[PDB]
Amino acid sequence: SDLGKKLLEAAHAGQDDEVRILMANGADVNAMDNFGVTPLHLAAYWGHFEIVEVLLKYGADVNASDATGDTPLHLAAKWGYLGIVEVLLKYGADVNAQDKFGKTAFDISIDNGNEDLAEILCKNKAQQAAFYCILHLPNLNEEQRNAFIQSLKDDPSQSANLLAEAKKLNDAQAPK
Amino acid sequence: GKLVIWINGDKGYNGLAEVGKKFEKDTGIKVTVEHPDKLEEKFPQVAATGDGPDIIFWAHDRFGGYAQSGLLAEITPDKAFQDKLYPFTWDAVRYNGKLIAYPIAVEALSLIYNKDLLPNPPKTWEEIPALDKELKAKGKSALMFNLQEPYFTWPLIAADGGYAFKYENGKYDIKDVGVDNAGAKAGLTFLVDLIKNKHMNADTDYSIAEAAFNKGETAMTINGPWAWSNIDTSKVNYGVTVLPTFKGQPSKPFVGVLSAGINAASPNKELAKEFLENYLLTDEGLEAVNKDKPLGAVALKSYEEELAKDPRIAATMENAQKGEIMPNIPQMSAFWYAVRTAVINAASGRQTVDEALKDAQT
């Protein structure tokens, strides 16, 4: 009933500067329509990268689901928008989230033949799985955590190697 | 010792009068064709007193009602004549196991596309988001059609498992009403996805879609033969084709069958039978009517084979043969009203597709 509406519209239309001044005037960056479609949904779906970036920078809920079960990661995946997918992944887009058909952004990417997209999605899921492991390995104080998380960013090739250490560490740091 | 015929004013009633002249020339019997407005209301009113036309032409959906009131004589074509018409058309005019009219013409929605914008029209509903993406980039849309009337949104809702009533035992099955099942839900959810992703607008009605297509703004529309004329004037280079599939299954549009019934109170029943079977339902008879005002696709196999050389008519019959005969039943009105509200609620986001469908049935 004011700015949110205008924002959803400008996001849909790809009018960058219009989106950015609406923001600077206080628009709810997560304004929804009657389908719970957010500005981030429309920009992802319609290919407006800079707008996606602007909305994320302003605290857009990167993992928002509309009433239909779609996330912006799902929407971007159908069109093979590499840049858009990359930047959603940077802001914490959820590679595990499933749409109405039980599909992930990876499944969609596989469905539409988009190999470039599937790859990015694939190695993101794998590196996150690695990160998540470290963070829930009980026998690790907040120091030894950072030690491993960092060394996973600096050598994602020796990752599976590194997880194996973090576990044998965890098993030597246990009441065995 | 004469024949009075009633038919609506948008039909080729002058061509029909020519068939009547031939009939008189052969038999001496004068044939009078009239086209009273609201004749679909006039006929049951005056037939109730034993008056009216010997023969009435109208859409089949109305005849179930007339038969109920004992206004329509049973027709007696032998199986040889019945074989001259497409079998599914005899179902539009069967009531309580008695044939109560002669099928004349067949009416259904088809996909209409702008050959300039879109030379190879999609075979599936699924391709259409993609196409809209492409077309929107240059200031066009893929598809605009009446989203307000179920008649238009039903062929998709029906495609994966929807149905009004199933045709068990030649009559209708009134018990299972197919607006709350998984196949309909899938139909309506795909529609709703078109809407929420901005490929279509929920407020699009008949006038908006027609203007949009006829001005070159959208690559496709969904309409029936009655709309061809305005497009002809508009000079858009269009063609008319099979309705797109959804989850592999045909879009099932409702079929309307223009039918000719014989007044129950008529003393000229054999004359009327003679006129309909051996004068009108012939290549030359339908031709006379069709030259005056196009019938679209016809029930008669011989003449439909000729008309179908027009691709648009061919598409109209292919879509008809793939659809469901409009139920000639009274509780169709309850159905329509339910379906109508379920679609608006869902398309508006008022209700989830789930709640919307199970609600319009209570």
Numbering used by the authors:
A (entry chain A): 12 to 135, 1218 to 1269
B (entry chain B): 5 to 366
Tell me, in the authors' exact words, what the paper reports.
Here we propose a novel method for connecting the pre-existing α-helices of two proteins into a single extended helix using a chemical cross linker. EY-CBS (3,3′-ethyne-1,2-diylbis-{6-[(chloroacetyl)amino]benzenesulfonic acid}) is a chemical cross linker that can react simultaneously with two cysteines in the i and i+11 positions of the α-helix19. To test whether EY-CBS detects the formation of a helix, we chose two amino acid residues separated by 11 amino acids in the proposed fusion helix and mutated them to cysteines. In conclusion, we have developed a new method that can convert two pre-existing α-helices into one long extended helix.
We chose an artificial ankyrin protein, named ‘mbp3-16', that has been engineered to bind maltose-binding protein (MBP), and the B4 domain of protein A as a model system to test our fusion helix method. To verify fusion of the helices, we crystallized the 3,311 fusion protein before and after reaction with EY-CBS and determined the structures of the two products. Since the ankyrin domain, mbp3–16, had been engineered to bind MBP, we were able to use MBP to facilitate crystallization. In the crystal structure, one MBP molecule interacted exclusively with the mbp3–16 component of the hybrid protein and there was no interaction with either protein A or the fusion helix. The electron density map calculated using the refined protein structure showed a clear density corresponding to the EY-CBS, and one EY-CBS molecule could be modelled into the density. Both reactive ends of the EY-CBS are covalently linked to the cysteines in the fusion helix. In the crystal structure, the fusion helix adopts a nearly ideal α-helical structure and matches closely to the intended structure. The Cα atoms of the cysteines are separated by 16.8 angstrom and the mutated alanines are located under the phenyl rings of EY-CBS, as designed. The structures of the ankyrin and protein A domains are easily superimposable on those of the isolated proteins, which demonstrates that the helix fusion has no impact on the structure of the protein other than near the fusion site. The sulfate moieties of the EY-CBS groups form nonspecific ionic interactions with three lysine groups of the protein A and ankyrin domains.
